[PDB]
Design a protein around this ligand. Structure first.
Ligand SMILES: NC(=O)c1ccc[n+]([C@@H]2O[C@H](COP(=O)([O-])OP(=O)(O)OC[C@H]3O[C@@H](n4cnc5c(N)ncnc54)[C@H](O)[C@@H]3O)[C@@H](O)[C@H]2O)c1
Ligand SMILES: NC(=O)c1ccc[n+]([C@@H]2O[C@H](COP(=O)([O-])OP(=O)(O)OC[C@H]3O[C@@H](n4cnc5c(N)ncnc54)[C@H](O)[C@@H]3O)[C@@H](O)[C@H]2O)c1
Ligand SMILES: *C(=O)[C@H](O)COP(=O)(O)O
Ligand SMILES: *C(=O)[C@H](O)COP(=O)(O)O
Lengths: 473, 473
């Protein structure tokens, strides 16, 4: 049982939202069914407080938070696993990412990206210099999804702190406890409590306030397309940073040797199953050129079969559950539907509630739901594509999504052709689409995002207003 | 009588929009009453065309456009003056600015702001490099206001061309002809005609299509708050760059000598009346600290009285008309209302239709409509403020706007206090709020803009998507 954290105060309601462990569907916790008025109060506190932390003080808070994450990683990952159902291996990894987010944000605090312009440049010129600086917003609204209960909150909160913003976070009702815990760690690390509130509740009660509150200068949201579009419609005249799904390919080109196909098979399996496949940039389509598919697929099958799936709290489990039974069932349905359309299921030890095995399916039709829609689970689906790069690129670009991608090849000419031709935010050569550092520009186009970049550096710019001033010179 | 320019083709309709000369209210021109289908066609052409211009070719087109603007400046300013009513002096000046915009955009074509990241940064590190590059959008929608019929179109089109975008412009029905003329110059300068259309019509018919067309990746708008908010509400899930009005101060501090007050008076009069005061960053509130107001005001009066206002086509006219008689009447009303509330009218030779003289009004109440609302005419209104910087800053920040500002003082300590304390996009020391170069970051906060920067350099970044790619290293 965990109250909301509203500027460092514990705030409860009578009604509760129950949090269930997807492994066995038991209640592992409860948080308040907060209402608009709670969000409203959090935003008023955020608006009224004017942070005065020096860059040194910000760095010290952010680095202390990193140290606390590392020190408490076992405890934090337990909370993640118990709420989300991913393996301890995956949740421990997630704490490591949050540790990087806070560390990198702390280190970026010393960096001033101000610019200077000389004005004697044209016939309209003057003896004068223009200088730029950045200032924080009134308040920032952060709405986070279930797939990274810790790291998604870190990515929105760390850059806010580093820029002297005040943020209010509404985590998903499915995995709210991790966020509440992160808030406690931040207060303990010395954050002025007005800079952070974490409120909880049903979208129907508190969701709209997060979007429309008059103090909110910026809404940063990560989650699904439908919820994303709704937000974009309802948050008028607010800056919006919306990251919606992906449907990202790992592309296997026909120049690879058998040793390379094996390394690619490693990437395909890891990319498709890490975090139970619950990543906007998970491998959701393995596009394998026809002439190597016969050697490639077996290598993939063999690796999938090595994966231990089961009890998420067992430290030797690789693959835990997906978010719930209904999602798992939907994913299995899409598999079955694809098999009826010609697909060849090579490995499917059977689903158990929310626990989905790393199902390997070959010869998936590219227009079947399994790969055309976003399938947010640990399916390993190989689509066989022509030994033609133009046709492969056209196919890769044929979905509503455009986030990341991975391409395995040794031919530079083809590398650069894919880099130029894939309609995505990121193209990784010889890595999964999921690969990034926590501070590189991140974001998609098309239905994957509204077109603004994220990651620690771009988030920090995004959470500020640039002010210019000029002086006689 | 001018047709629309749709990808280089002249396109007419039966119904006409009449363009009147605000000096004598005669019809000087006509353009088509375009409809949604015309905008629709322009956008389809824009989306389907993929520009392949090298940076060299873009530069050559932009610099050739600048040369044409210079060579035809008399012809172009005639068209501006006949449409808007500003003096030839102001319209010639506007051509010079458009000349700078195209020149600077042309020169920025050689600049590649890509970055490189090393990935071996954390325990999660890899021997890998990430590189960034920019790519154009599908189509850009540009909507422009009447106050700079040439330069506002330049600022939205030049950066599009520089980045290989395709843009469709809908100028205001009040001053569309200048835009149509700029399109001919661009075609003549070698622009692939698919990269530019200029459509015209009533907002009721064609305006919504410019906001909601499915090919539009970004809407860039400059105009009024109400129209701006309407666009933000209707353009969901499109990037939006909205610049709305300002209500900007020139602030006179009490450390100034009498010689300095005279220089400040020069800025006050120029800033309040240039372009008939029709600038988002016009001086609309002269905040003079009380202890110097008795010496400052007379210097303002004396300078105002030197301005020649009248026939805009007379080359010795300083100040031409405002956009129309209704606007002129509204502004005069606000002056009268302010005098009933205690203001002191020091100079008012009388309005004549759309021709407003540079009225000087002292002791204006800060909450009177004249200065609280945005008054888009050549009024010179002095608000007497306390000899107290905190009170002066609070007063300056008390409106719904926050765009630019000017401060006249020699005390560094006070300079930096204003620079830090004014809630605006720009603070100019010893210049009018309107001062900028065509490539410095430009944009307001609060009701002045939705929070994204403009100017040639920021517009170019804005009109692209950043793609990243990583390579094994
Ligand atoms: O499932 P998922 O978390 O992966 O993605 P999702 O798109 O369904 O939701 C992600 C986040 O948005 C929130 N949300 C859902 N409906 C909302 C609404 N109407 N207004 C505001 N926020 C809302 C969720 O609670 C969650 O925090
Ligand atoms: O007067 P001002 O020029 O300074 O600013 P304004 O807001 O009144 O108009 C600026 C631009 O917005 C356009 N516009 C007006 N109403 C619109 C609508 N309902 N939908 C789409 N576009 C619209 C105008 O025609 C003009 O091009
Ligand atoms: C998607 O998962 C989310 O927006 C961030 O991507 P990760 O790299 O998976 O965090
Ligand atoms: C306001 O006029 C418009 O946004 C641009 O401002 P100028 O400085 O007048 O060009």
């Amino acid at each position: 049982h965990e109250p909301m954290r509203i500027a460092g105060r514990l705030v409860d309601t009578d009604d509760r939202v129950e949090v269930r462990y997807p492994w066995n569907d038991t209640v592992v916790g409860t948080v308040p069914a907060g209402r608009a008025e709670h969000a409203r109060e959090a935003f008023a506190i955020a608006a009224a407080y004017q942070p005065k932390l020096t860059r040194y003080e910000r760095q010290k808070i952010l680095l202390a938070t990193a140290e606390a994450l590392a020190a408490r990683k076992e405890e934090i990952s337990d909370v993640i696993t118990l709420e989300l159902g991913i393996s301890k291996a995956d949740s421990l990894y997630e704490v490591g990412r949050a540790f990087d987010v806070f560390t990198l944000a702390g280190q970026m605090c010393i960096r001033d990206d101000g610019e200077i312009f000389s004005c004697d440049l044209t016939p309209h010129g003057k003896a004068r210099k223009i200088f730029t600086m950045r200032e924080p917003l009134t308040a920032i609204s952060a709405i986070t999804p279930f797939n990274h209960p810790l790291n998604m909150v870190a990515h929105k909160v760390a850059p806010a702190i580093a820029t002297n913003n005040c943020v209010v976070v509404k985590p998903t009702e499915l995995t709210p406890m991790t966020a509440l815990l992160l808030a406690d760690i931040l207060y303990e690390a010395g954050l002025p409590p007005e800079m952070l509130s974490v409120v909880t509740g049903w979208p129907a009660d508190i969701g709209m306030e997060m979007i429309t509150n008059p103090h909110v200068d910026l809404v940063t949201f990560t989650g699904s397309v439908p919820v994303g579009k709704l937000i974009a419609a309802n948050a008028h005249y607010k800056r919006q940073v919306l990251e919606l799904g992906g449907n990202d390919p790992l592309i296997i080109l026909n120049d690879l040797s058998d040793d390379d196909l094996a390394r690619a098979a490693d990437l395909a399996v890891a990319g498709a199953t890490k975090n139970s496949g619950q990543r906007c940039t998970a491998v959701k389509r393995i596009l394998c050129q026809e002439s190597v598919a016969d050697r490639f697929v077996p290598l993939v099958l063999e690796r999938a079969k090595r994966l231990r799936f089961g009890d998420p709290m067992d430290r030797s489990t690789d693959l835990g559950t997906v978010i719930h039974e209904k999602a798992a069932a939907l994913f299995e349905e899409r598999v079955m539907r694809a098999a009826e359309e010609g697909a060849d299921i090579l490995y499917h030890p059977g689903r158990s509630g929310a626990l989905l095995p790393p199902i390997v399916v070959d010869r998936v039709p590219h227009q079947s739901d399994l790969v055309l829609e976003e399938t947010f689970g640990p399916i390993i689906p190989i689509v066989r594509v022509p030994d033609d790069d133009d046709a492969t690129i056209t196919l890769s670009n044929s979905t509503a999504f455009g986030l990341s991608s991975g391409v395995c090849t040794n031919d530079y000419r083809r590398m650069q052709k894919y880099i130029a031709g894939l309609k995505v935010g990121t193209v990784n050569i010889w890595e999964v689409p999921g690969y990034r550092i926590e501070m590189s520009p991140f974001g998609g186009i098309k239905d994957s995002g509204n077109g603004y970049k994220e990651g620690v550096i771009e988030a920090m710019k995004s959470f500020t207003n640039v002010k210019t001033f000029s002086l006689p010179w």
